[PDB]
Nucleic acid binder design. Structure first.
Ligand SMILES: Cc1cn([C@H]2C[C@H](N=[N+]=[N-])[C@@H](COP(=O)(O)OP(=O)(O)OP(=O)(O)O)O2)c(=O)[nH]c1=O
Ligand SMILES: [Mg+2]
Lengths: 412, 555
DNA sequence: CAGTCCCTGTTCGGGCGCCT
DNA sequence: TGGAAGGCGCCCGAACAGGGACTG
C-alpha cells in the first residue's frame, strides 16, 4: 500500500522485445526457485503471450558469493526510460568519492522490492524463463514492484533512500555516499577497522528500515594511470627506429609536440632491418624532448557530463590488458593496465570479463556512469561465454572490434 | 447464452486499425462438400456461430487433407488480419531433441483432439473472424461465421494455445513431480519410472484432468507400443531414430530439387555421421528461378553419392544419462567442413551434426574450429543444459600458440587432443623479430582511382628492385601484390616492410584460406618460407626504403 | 577537411527441411 | 487446383554500416 510513481518511455518509443538466450541447467534451476519464492511473495506474477514485451534474464554469483542472484538485462529497457532517470529523478555525483581511501559496495537492491510499481509500466518488465530441451514453453512473468537493475528503480526509491540514510549522514558527517543502481558506494578516509565497522553500522541502520545486504572494497587513491612509454636501448637497429617512429607518429595525434624529423633522418637509406644505427646529437635530443612530452598531461581534456564514455581494451598477451576511457577520440580521460587477473594464462574470455567489470566500476566511482565498451573479441565468442564469468549486478553496453596491432602504442 | 471452459486471454488490434475485409476464393465444390460437412457440425458444439451482417469483415477459406489420413483439415488464411493483429511474444522457444530425453521405464504419447478448437477465444475479439462458406452453385449465399475459439491459421493461435495448456498442465505436474511431460503444441510425451500399470493409471488420471478443461484425448494415443512416433522420430526403450528419409530420385534437377535435397540432408545430419552439403549448395548460388534446371557437377555428384551411402545403413541415437559426462568430438572434413558426434559411452552417439559456415573473407582452420566448438556449445546448452567435454583434432601446443598470440580474446572450454587426422595446424608463423642475414624488401603499390591502373614493386638493401604494371586494380590489391612479389623473389628467409595496414592485418592473422586468389597465392608462398618477418611503417614519413618504393610506384 | 571508393562484416528476408 | 500459422535449423544474396586511405 504505497503511491506508485507513474513512468513513461522516452517520447516516440516502444518497449523492449529481446529474445531469451539459452540457459544452463544450474541457472534454470536457480531461476525457477528464485522466481517461485518471488511469486509467493507477490513481487512478480505470471502473464501470457498477450504481452508483446520481453527482457532476457539469467543468474550469477557475486564474487565469492556461492548464492545465486537473479539478474535481468534491462539495457534495452533502460535505454527507453532514459528521459526519466537522467532528466527528472536522477542523482548528483560526489566528486569526492574517488578521492576516498576506501570504498565499499553494498547490494541494497532488496530495498527496491518494498516499493510497488506503476501498473501501466509492468507490461514492460516482461521476462521469459526457458526450459531445458524445450520440455515446456516459456514461463512468462512481469514485475509488480521495483525491479533490480532497472534504472528507474534507484531513482524512484531515492526519497526513501535519502530518508533512511540521513541519520547516518548526520551521525558521520564526512563519509561520502553514492548510489548507482542496485549498489550503494560508500567511502571514507578512516582506517580499515573504523571503516569496516562504520559499514556494519550502516548495515544495521539499513536493517531497522526493513532491508538485508547479502562487501567489495575498492581504493580509488590506489588507482593509477598507464602512460605511453618509449623504449631504452644502448644500440638501435633500423627496425628499432622504424618501430619507434611509427609509435611516436601515432602518439602525435595525442601529444602534438611529438617530433619525428631527426629520428626519421637516421633511416634515410635502404637498409637492412638488423643493421645497427647509432644516434645523432639532434635525434638523441628529439628523443629526449619526446620522452619529456609523454610525461605531461594531454592539454584540454576534461569530462563532459553530456557525453557518453567509451572504453577500449587491447589484449597485450601474457596476462596483460590495456584500456583507455575517453569521450572524444585522442582526448583520454584515463588509461590503464590490468595484469594477473583471474584466468590469466588460461582463459581470455574470463579475463576480458574481469577487465570490463573493473573498468565499469572505476567509471561509476569516477564519473557515475558506465562506459560503452569496444571489445577485442568476436561477437559469438563473447555471447557464448560472458555470463559464466559475470559477477556484477549491472551490465554495460558493448560492441565488437577487430583492430590488429600494427604498432604497440599502449604497452611496451 | 454459451458456456465458459477455461480462462481467456485478452487481445487487441494494432491501435487505431480495423479488421479483415477481402473477398473469398473461387473454391472448387469438391472441397466445399468436405467443408460444409464438418463446418455445420461445428456450431452444435459452440465452435462457430451464425452472424448478422452487422459484422462487416470478410476472409478467404480453404482446407488441406491431413497427411497420412483420409480426413480433412480446415485452414483460414488470415494474412490480412495477421498484418493488422497485435504482436505477440512467442512462448515456443525451440524444438525438443530426442537425444535430450532421459531413459524412462514407461512412456506414453497422447495428442489432444481438436486442440485450437478447445480453447476459448477472446470475448471482445471474436468479431474479426468473419469468413463465408461456399456452395454447389453461386445462387445460395452460405452462412457467415465468427469463431468462438482459436482458428487454425491466425497468428495468435499457437502462443495462446501453448500458454493456456501450460497453465492447465501446471497443477497436475506439481502433484506429480516425478512425471515427465514434454508439451509441444498439443503433443504430450509422458514418461515415468512407474510400473507400466501404475503409470497407465496416471495417464488416465491426466486424461481426466485435461477433461475438466474441455480437452479430449482420443485413442489416437500411443499406449504400449514402442516405437512411439514423436516429433518426426521413432522412440524405443533404449534407442531412437529419425523416421525414414526419402531422397528425391530426379534425373534432371531444378533449383527447388537441390533445395529439398539439401534440407533433407540437413535433417539427416542430426544422426547420420558425415553428411556434407557443400558442393550441392554451391549449385544454388546467384540463381533466379526455383523452377530453373541446373546440371550436377562432378563434385556435387560425388558428394550426393557418398551421402547416399551414409544414409543407406540404418543408424540410431541413444538417450541421456545425467550421471555421465557429455563428450563432443570433431572431425575436419576439408574445404571448411566440420562434423561432430556428441556421446557419453564411446561409439554410442546421443546425436551428430555439422558446421559448414564460411565466415570471413580470410580465415583459417583454427578459427573455424573455434566457431564449431561454439556452435556445439550453444547447441548442447540448449539440449542438456550443460557444456560437453571436447575432443579436438588439434594439438595442445598449436592451440596454445594461436590463442596466446592472437590479438583477440579467444577460448575453448575443457577439451583434449584426439589424434584423429587430418590435424588442425597453423601453416606458417611470422617472426616476432627481424631476421639477421635475410634480405630486406621495402614494398609498395599504388593505383589510379580513374585508370584502375597501378604499380606494385619493391626495393631491397642488396640493391634488388622491381616494378610491375597492373591493370584494373585497386590500392589494396597493389599493396598485397607488392608483398606477393617480395615473397616470390626472395630467399627462404625474408624481411618485408609494408606500409599497408590492410595487407598486414590480413596476413598477421595467419589465414590458410581466402576468397581472394591473390591472398591464396600469398598464403601458398608464406607456407614455403622458413622465416618471414613482416614490419609496418607509416607512409609519407620519409622512412628508409619506404620513400624510395613509394616513388617507384607512383611514377 | 567532407566526399568518394574499397573492403570486410553484420543483418535480414527468402527458399528449403522438420514439427504441430 | 493456387492458397494459413508459429517455432527451430541450413544456405544464399542483397542491404546497410563503418574504418582507412586517397582526393577534390
Ligand atoms: C499440422 C498443423 C497443425 N496446426 C495446429 C493447430 C492444431 N490445433 N487445432 N485445432 C494443432 C494440432 O494439430 P493436430 O495435432 O495435428 O490435430 P488436431 O487439430 O489437434 O486434431 P486431431 O487430429 O484429432 O488430433 O496444431 C496448424 O495450425 N497447422 C498445421 O498444418
Ligand atoms: Mg491434435
Amino acid at each position: 500500500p504505497i503511491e506508485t510513481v507513474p513512468v513513461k518511455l522516452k517520447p516516440g518509443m516502444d518497449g523492449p522485445k529481446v529474445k531469451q538466450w539459452p540457459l544452463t541447467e544450474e541457472k534454470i534451476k536457480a531461476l525457477v526457485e528464485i522466481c517461485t519464492e518471488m511469486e509467493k511473495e507477490g513481487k512478480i506474477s505470471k502473464i501470457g503471450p498477450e504481452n508483446p514485451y520481453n527482457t532476457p534474464v539469467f543468474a550469477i554469483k557475486k564474487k565469492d558469493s556461492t548464492k545465486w542472484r537473479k539478474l535481468v538485462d534491462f539495457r534495452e529497457l533502460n535505454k527507453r526510460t532514459q528521459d526519466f532517470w537522467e532528466v527528472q529523478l536522477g542523482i548528483p555525483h560526489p566528486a569526492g568519492l574517488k578521492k576516498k581511501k576506501s570504498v565499499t559496495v553494498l547490494d541494497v537492491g532488496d530495498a527496491y522490492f518494498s516499493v510497488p510499481l506503476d501498473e501501466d509500466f509492468r507490461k514492460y518488465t516482461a521476462f521469459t524463463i526457458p526450459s531445458i530441451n524445450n520440455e515446456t514453453p516459456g514461463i512468462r512473468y512481469q514485475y509488480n514492484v521495483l525491479p533490480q537493475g532497472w534504472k528507474g528503480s534507484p531513482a524512484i526509491f531515492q526519497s526513501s533512500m535519502t530518508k533512511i540514510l540521513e541519520p547516518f549522514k548526520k551521525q558521520n558527517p564526512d563519509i561520502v555516499i553514492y548510489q548507482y543502481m542496485d549498489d550503494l558506494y560508500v567511502g571514507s578516509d578512516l582506517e580499515i577497522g573504523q571503516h569496516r565497522t562504520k559499514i556494519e553500522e550502516l548495515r544495521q541502520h539499513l536493517l531497522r528500515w526493513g532491508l538485508t545486504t547479502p562487501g567489495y572494497e575498492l581504493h580509488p587513491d590506489k588507482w593509477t594511470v598507464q602512460p605511453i612509454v618509449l623504449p631504452e636501448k644502448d644500440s638501435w637497429t633500423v627496425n628499432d627506429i622504424q618501430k619507434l617512429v611509427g609509435k611516436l607518429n601515432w602518439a602525435s595525434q595525442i601529444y602534438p609536440g611529438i617530433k619525428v624529423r631527426q629520428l626519421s633522418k637516421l633511416l634515410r637509406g635502404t637498409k637492412a632491418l638488423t643493421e645497427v644505427i647509432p644516434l645523432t646529437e639532434e635525434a638523441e635530443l628529439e628523443l629526449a624532448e619526446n620522452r619529456e612530452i609523454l610525461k605531461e598531461p594531454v592539454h584540454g581534456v576534461y569530462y563532459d557530463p553530456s557525453k557518453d564514455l567509451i572504453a577500449e581494451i587491447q589484449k597485450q598477451g601474457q596476462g596483460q590488458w590495456t584500456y583507455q576511457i575517453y569521450q572524444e577520440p585522442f582526448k583520454n580521460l584515463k588509461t590503464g593496465k590490468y595484469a594477473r587477473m583471474r584466468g590469466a594464462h588460461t582463459n581470455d574470455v574470463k579475463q576480458l570479463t574481469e577487465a570490463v567489470q573493473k573498468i565499469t566500476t572505476e567509471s561509476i566511482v569516477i564519473w557515475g556512469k558506465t562506459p560503452k565498451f569496444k571489445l577485442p573479441i568476436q561477437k559469438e565468442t563473447w555471447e557464448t561465454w560472458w555470463t559464466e564469468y559475470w559477477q556484477a549486478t549491472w551490465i554495460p553496453e558493448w560492441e565488437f572490434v577487430n583492430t590488429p596491432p600494427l604498432v604497440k602504442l599502449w604497452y611496451q | 447464452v454459451p458456456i465458459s471452459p477455461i480462462e481467456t486471454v485478452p487481445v487487441k488490434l494494432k491501435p487505431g486499425m480495423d479488421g479483415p475485409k477481402v473477398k473469398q476464393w473461387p473454391l472448387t465444390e469438391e472441397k466445399i462438400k468436405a467443408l460444409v460437412e464438418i463446418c455445420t457440425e461445428m456450431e452444435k458444439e459452440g465452435k462457430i456461430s451464425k452472424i448478422g451482417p452487422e459484422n462487416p469483415y470478410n476472409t478467404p477459406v480453404f482446407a488441406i487433407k491431413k497427411k497420412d489420413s483420409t480426413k480433412w483439415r480446415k485452414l483460414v488464411d488470415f494474412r490480412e488480419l495477421n498484418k493488422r493483429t497485435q504482436d505477440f511474444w512467442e512462448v515456443q522457444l525451440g524444438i525438443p531433441h530426442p537425444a535430450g530425453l532421459k531413459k524412462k521405464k514407461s512412456v506414453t504419447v497422447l495428442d489432444v483432439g481438436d486442440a485450437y478448437f478447445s480453447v476459448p477465444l477472446d470475448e471482445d475479439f471474436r468479431k474479426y473472424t468473419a469468413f463465408t462458406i461456399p456452395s454447389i452453385n453461386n445462387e445460395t449465399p452460405g452462412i457467415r461465421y465468427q469463431y468462438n475459439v482459436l482458428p487454425q491459421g491466425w497468428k495468435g493461435s499457437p502462443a495462446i494455445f501453448q500458454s493456456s495448456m501450460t497453465k492447465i498442465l501446471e497443477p497436475f505436474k506439481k502433484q506429480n513431480p516425478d512425471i515427465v511431460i514434454y508439451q509441444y503444441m498439443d503433443d504430450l510425451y509422458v514418461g515415468s519410472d512407474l510400473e507400466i500399470g501404475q503409470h497407465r493409471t496416471k495417464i488416465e488420471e491426466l486424461r481426466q484432468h485435461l477433461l475438466r478443461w474441455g480437452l479430449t484425448t482420443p485413442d489416437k494415443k500411443h499406449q504400449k507400443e514402442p516405437p512411439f512416433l514423436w516429433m518426426g522420430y521413432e522412440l524405443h526403450p533404449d534407442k531412437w531414430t529419425v523416421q525414414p528419409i526419402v531422397l528425391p530420385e530426379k534425373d534432371s534437377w531444378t533449383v527447388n530439387d537441390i533445395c529439398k535435397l539439401v534440407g533433407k540432408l540437413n535433417w539427416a545430419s542430426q544422426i547420420y555421421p558425415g553428411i556434407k552439403v557443400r558442393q550441392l549448395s554451391k549449385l544454388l548460388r546467384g540463381t533466379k528461378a526455383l523452377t530453373e534446371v541446373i546440371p550436377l557437377t562432378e563434385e556435387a555428384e560425388l558428394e550426393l553419392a557418398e551421402n547416399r551411402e551414409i544414409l543407406k545403413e540404418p543408424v540410431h541415437g541413444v538417450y541421456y544419462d545425467p550421471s555421465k559426462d557429455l563428450i563432443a568430438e570433431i572431425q575436419k572434413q576439408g574445404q571448411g567442413q566440420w562434423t561432430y558426434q556428441i556421446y557419453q559411452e564411446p561409439f554410442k552417439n546421443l546425436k551428430t551434426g555439422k558446421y559448414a559456415r564460411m565466415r570471413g573473407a580470410h580465415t583459417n582452420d583454427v578459427k573455424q574450429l573455434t566457431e564449431a566448438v561454439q556452435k556445439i556449445t550453444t547447441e548442447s546448452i540448449v539440449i542438456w543444459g550443460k557444456t560437453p567435454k571436447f575432443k579436438l583434432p588439434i594439438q595442445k601446443e598449436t592451440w596454445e600458440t594461436w590463442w596466446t598470440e592472437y590479438w583477440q580474446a579467444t577460448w575453448i572450454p575443457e577439451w583434449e587432443f584426439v589424434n584423429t587426422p587430418p590435424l588442425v595446424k597453423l601453416w606458417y608463423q611470422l617472426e616476432k623479430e627481424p631476421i639477421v642475414g635475410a634480405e630486406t624488401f621495402y614494398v609498395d603499390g599504388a593505383a589510379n582511382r580513374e585508370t584502375k591502373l597501378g604499380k606494385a614493386g619493391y626495393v631491397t638493401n642488396k640493391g634488388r628492385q622491381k616494378v610491375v604494371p597492373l591493370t584494373n586494380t585497386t590500392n589494396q590489391k597493389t599493396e598485397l601484390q607488392a608483398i606477393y612479389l617480395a615473397l616470390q623473389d626472395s630467399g627462404l628467409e625474408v624481411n618485408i616492410v609494408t606500409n599497408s595496414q590492410y595487407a598486414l592485418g590480413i596476413i598477421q592473422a595467419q589465414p590458410d584460406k581466402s576468397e581472394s586468389e591473390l591472398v591464396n597465392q600469398i598464403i601458398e608462398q608464406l607456407i614455403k618460407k622458413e622465416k618471414v618477418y613482416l614490419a609496418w611503417v607509416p607512409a609519407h614519413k620519409g622512412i628508409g626504403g619506404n620513400e624510395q618504393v613509394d616513388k617507384l610506384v607512383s611514377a
